[PDB]
Amino acid sequence: GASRTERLLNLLLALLNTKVGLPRAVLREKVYHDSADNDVAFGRMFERDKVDLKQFGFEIETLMDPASARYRIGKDSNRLPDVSLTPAESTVLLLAAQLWERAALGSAAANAVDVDLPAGVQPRIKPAGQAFDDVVAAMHGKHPIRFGYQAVSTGREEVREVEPWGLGSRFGQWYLVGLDRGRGAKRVFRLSRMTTAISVLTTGSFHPPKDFNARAELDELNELPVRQATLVIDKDKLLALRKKATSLQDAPDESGRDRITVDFRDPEQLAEELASYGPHVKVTGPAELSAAVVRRLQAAADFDDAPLPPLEFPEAGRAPRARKRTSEDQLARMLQLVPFLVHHQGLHIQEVADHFGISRKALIDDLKILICSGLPEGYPDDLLDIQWENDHVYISEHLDLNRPVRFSEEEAAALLTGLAMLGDLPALAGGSGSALESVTIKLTGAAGEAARLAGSVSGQSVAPEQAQAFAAITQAIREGRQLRLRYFSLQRDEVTERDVDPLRLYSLDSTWYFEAYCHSKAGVRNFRLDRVESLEPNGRAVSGSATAGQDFPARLFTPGEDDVLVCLELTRQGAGLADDYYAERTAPLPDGGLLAEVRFGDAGWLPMFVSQHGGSVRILEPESLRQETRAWIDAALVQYDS
Ligand SMILES: [K+]
């Protein structure tokens, strides 16, 4: 079972590595050491693995001139960058990319000693959670809606009166389709082109037409023209952006800056990304792109100019709680949504929520995390077609046209890390054949030998300075012992001291971590091995408080030791950000906005966050961080006032 998955992975890497080809005798020793039976039983299990690898899209070439044969995959290369993914595989891969991104952020903040996202992380461009909630709520309650819409001819801003039939994703971008009562015909609206939040007309009713096909309506959509942007950027900055550059040269007058061109289709999408970069970029052209960036920066300046609301939070007993930090149960359930989403009849929300024993709204939030969170960097934009009608979500299968995707070594390795965490989730009663398994094998071929470290949550070697702590944690877990932990602060000038119940030791991105129930925080935390100052048994048995309580976050989602606590004001349009960042507390504000207290992983990410969201966010406290963000925005704005 597990030995077959691992055996396939090892076989695939051995054949990929050899440029000359390996004979059967060498493969037996390298991969099939486990098989205690001789050539007879191994020979057929080898033949079965060859057949099985071919079904994952790997053709084993035989070079010979019996037992005289040599085998290899990929001919002279040791990677296969091109894979064909089914919709199920692509959706799993989407969750994996989200896990990688959280791992990458933790490592960048933790290993910092002037903000800059790490390699393989780009700003997250996603449809607004609130607008999504409002369309979904409108359809559920059979209410028509109204919203500001910037016209197809980029003409006047215009309020549209719509009966919503469906939401849909094509080319990574989300659309609303519905009956436009002003035109008396159906119309498609790009969410990015809405000027307002959606007002749900809860006094009204409508029925959608029985003969309405959301997939056929959205399939008729034609991709936007690929336009060219001209950008001046600071040297040695904005790595994800430079990955997209079609040309590069020194900037005409500004020292230490480059002039690049990048291709984009939707200018609202590019402007949100570029606003997140603040003063590190200036749009020189085109003007529609430039005006969108300034608007976001300016709307962010103006919100910080607005007077401060009172910092009054309710007792949080009479309020609806924000999204909780994602747990292993939720991750496992989201994997189990995939077969519904790709089945020919799709995912019927009420019926599937009942089946999992959760509310309708809880199930919708699972889906928003999974498929409405945008595409991380290194995840391709032309992989998933999504339709979301009233109570009905389905990822359309384009028959016998698996979309080929190319991954670099780095992108495949990053994704394998997210897949290996998904692969380490608790085993259920019911393995083989799943989409998780198949996309893991395919991405392994795209990473080559780098898959061996990246595709594992346990094999990484241990630096000598960490070996002592690695052995003490290992033994404490095995013997059920509590540990007294002295943990370095980020700067390593101080230590916190605390009793912990060690639970799991695991590696990610060449880093060792241990999950432990911390008796000082009274919750599960995930610590970096290379930040342990010392660990000693304290003579007590593990308390077992981890299994007590309610659920706890999965390992990439626990609050970090280095988090900085920030109080935000959100507009109604941006109210969904309080869920994205698992707000500790919220307070509703008169016009549908809210106060939100959130933990950010690093104070350096905050100005990018605020400028990215272009007026839907402001920092209230602490004052130091608020002004430091206003300076980022002001420095960004002063590039254009000339
Ligand atoms: K090869």
Cα dihedral 382/384/385/387 (nearest 10): -150
Confirm whether 582 is domain-assigned: yes
Å from CA of 54 to ligand 1 middle: 15
Of 63, 78, 93, the residue that ends a domain is 78
3-class state of residue 506 by DSSP: strand
3-class state of residue 250 by DSSP: strand
Å from CA of 49 to ligand 1 middle: 17
Q: Which helix (H) or strand (E) holds 418?
A: helix 409-423
Give the separation between CA 328 and CA 253, rounded to whole angstroms. 53
Q: How many CA atoms lie within 13 A of 576 on its CB side?
A: 18
**Is the bond leading into 209 cis (omega within 30 degrees of zero)?**
no
Structure token digits, residue 449: 């030998």
Å from CA of 377 to ligand 1 middle: 28
Give the separation between CA 172 and CA 181, rounded to whole angstroms. 27
Å from CA of 13 to ligand 1 middle: 9
- Examine the domain organization and report whether 272 and 239 are in the same domain: yes
What does DSSP assign to residue 194?
B
Q: What is the torsional sign of CA 460, 466, 467, 468? A: negative
Give the length of the chain. Answer: 642
Å from CA of 437 to ligand 1 middle: 22
Å from CA of 507 to ligand 1 middle: 28
Å from CA of 22 to ligand 1 middle: 10
Count CB-CB contacts under 10 A for residue 595: 22
Å from CA of 10 to ligand 1 middle: 14
Å from CA of 138 to ligand 1 middle: 55
Helical packing angle, 360-371 and 349-356, nearest 10°: 100
Å from CA of 379 to ligand 1 middle: 25
- List % helix, strand, coil for the chain (3-state, nearest 5): 35, 25, 40
Å from CA of 75 to ligand 1 middle: 5
Å from CA of 635 to ligand 1 middle: 51
List the CATH number of the domain containing 575.
3.30.70
* Burial of 227: CB neighbours in 10 Å, binned 0-12, 13-18, 19+: middle
* Burial of 34: CB neighbours in 10 Å, binned 0-12, 13-18, 19+: exposed
Give the separation between CA 494 and CA 531, rounded to whole angstroms. 11
Give the separation between CA 456 and CA 491, rounded to whole angstroms. 29
Å from CA of 14 to ligand 1 middle: 8
First to last CA, the chain: 66
Helical packing angle, 87-110 and 328-342, nearest 10°: 150
Residue 152 phi, psi dihedral angles, 5° rounding: -60, -35
Beta bridge partners of 179: 163, 186
Å from CA of 77 to ligand 1 middle: 5
Å from CA of 444 to ligand 1 middle: 14
**CA-closest candidate to residue 165, choices 201, 199, 208:** 208
Give the separation between CA 490 and CA 602, rounded to whole angstroms. 11
Tell me the DSSP string of 119-154: TT--------HHHHHHHHHHHHHT--EEEEEE-TTS
Where do the H-state alpha helices sit in 277-387?
287-305, 328-342, 349-356, 360-371
Å from CA of 72 to ligand 1 middle: 6
Confirm whether 631 is domain-assigned: yes
Of 495, 526, 541, the residue that ends a domain is 541
- Examine the domain organization and report whether 579 and 620 are in the same domain: yes
Give the separation between CA 507 and CA 500, rounded to whole angstroms. 19
Confirm whether 577 is domain-assigned: yes
- Examine the domain organization and report whether 524 and 470 are in the same domain: yes
Å from CA of 71 to ligand 1 middle: 9
Å from CA of 449 to ligand 1 middle: 11
User: How far from chain centre, in Å, is Cα 219?
Assistant: 26
Å from CA of 445 to ligand 1 middle: 11
- Examine the domain organization and report whether 525 and 577 are in the same domain: no
Å from CA of 406 to ligand 1 middle: 18
Å from CA of 48 to ligand 1 middle: 20
**CA-closest candidate to residue 89, choices 393, 378, 397, 328:** 397
Structure token digits, residue 506: 């695991």
- Examine the domain organization and report whether 529 and 580 are in the same domain: no
Å from CA of 78 to ligand 1 middle: 5
Å from CA of 93 to ligand 1 middle: 25
Å from CA of 56 to ligand 1 middle: 17
- Examine the domain organization and report whether 537 and 579 are in the same domain: no
Confirm whether 74 is domain-assigned: yes
Q: What is the torsional sign of CA 16, 17, 22, 26? A: negative
Give the separation between CA 481 and CA 502, rounded to whole angstroms. 8
Q: Can you give the resolution of this entry in Å?
A: 2.2
Give the separation between CA 400 and CA 330, rounded to whole angstroms. 31
132, 239, 435, 487, 601 from 102: Cα distances, Å: 23, 18, 22, 22, 10
Å from CA of 87 to ligand 1 middle: 28
3-class state of residue 31 by DSSP: coil
Contact indicator for 414, 451 with CB cutoff of 8 Å: no
List the CATH number of the domain containing 18.
1.10.10
Give the separation between CA 455 and CA 365, rounded to whole angstroms. 29
Give the domain range for residue 254.
Answer: 230-305
Å from CA of 446 to ligand 1 middle: 12
Å from CA of 16 to ligand 1 middle: 4
Structure token digits, residue 142: 């059979």
Å from CA of 80 to ligand 1 middle: 9
Confirm whether 46 is domain-assigned: yes
Q: Residue written as tokens 């599960």?
A: 524
Confirm whether 213 is domain-assigned: no
Strand positions, DSSP E, 386-522: 386-389, 392-395, 403-406, 481-488, 495-508, 511-518
Å from CA of 567 to ligand 1 middle: 54
Helical packing angle, 435-447 and 409-423, nearest 10°: 150
Å from CA of 244 to ligand 1 middle: 29
Confirm whether 24 is domain-assigned: yes
Å from CA of 21 to ligand 1 middle: 7
Contact indicator for 158, 95 with CB cutoff of 8 Å: no
Q: Which helix (H) or strand (E) holds 167?
A: strand 157-170
Å from CA of 409 to ligand 1 middle: 15
**CA-closest candidate to residue 165, choices 186, 182, 192:** 186
- Examine the domain organization and report whether 534 and 483 are in the same domain: yes
- The method of structure determination was X-ray
- Examine the domain organization and report whether 572 and 525 are in the same domain: no
Where do the H-state alpha helices sit in 519-621?
577-580, 605-612
List the CATH number of the domain containing 523.
2.30.30
Q: Number of structural domains, the chain?
A: 4
- Examine the domain organization and report whether 529 and 473 are in the same domain: yes
3-class state of residue 197 by DSSP: coil
Of 57, 78, 99, the residue that ends a domain is 78
Confirm whether 221 is domain-assigned: no
Å from CA of 541 to ligand 1 middle: 51
Beta bridge partners of 595: 569, 587
Give the separation between CA 20 and CA 11, rounded to whole angstroms. 15
- Examine the domain organization and report whether 516 and 582 are in the same domain: no
Å from CA of 241 to ligand 1 middle: 32
Give the separation between CA 580 and CA 619, rounded to whole angstroms. 16
Give the separation between CA 304 and CA 217, rounded to whole angstroms. 41
